[PDB]
Amino acid sequence: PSSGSSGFLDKPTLLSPEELKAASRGNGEYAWYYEGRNGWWQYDERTSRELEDAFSKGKKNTEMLIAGFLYVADLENMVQYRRNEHGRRRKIKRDIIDIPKKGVSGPSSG
């Protein structure tokens, strides 16, 4: 014989996406935003991890290499210009994001 219909999905509770955003806003995480068309655009995740690591570490200007693209981000002026193409450059701004980081804790040995 045969059988099958489709199945189900169902979903647990986690309160509204706003009730969380309340804290998740700042309690979430951060992200770097680079000037774009509309206004600013958020990086991938790693590319920023450097903008923060550098900035935090104390680095003023951090050089990044994108998909076959030598780029240089300067926190001093809060911008980013092409390694070779100094002309091509955009502004950058650190904004707060809501990433599920804190939630998924991951401590390490000291």
Q: Which residue ranges make up the annotated binding site?
A: 34, 37, 41, 71, 80, 90, 102
What is the C-alpha separation between 105 and 90, in angstroms, rounded? 34
Q: Could you give the dihedral angle defined by the CA atoms of residues 14, 18, 24 and 29, in that order, rounded to the nearest 10 degrees?
A: 120
Which amino acids are annotated as binding site for a glycoprotein, given as ranges? 34, 37, 41, 71, 80, 90, 102
Closest to 64 measured CA to CA, from 39, 56, 53: 53
**13 Cβ neighbours under 8 A, 6+ residues apart:** none
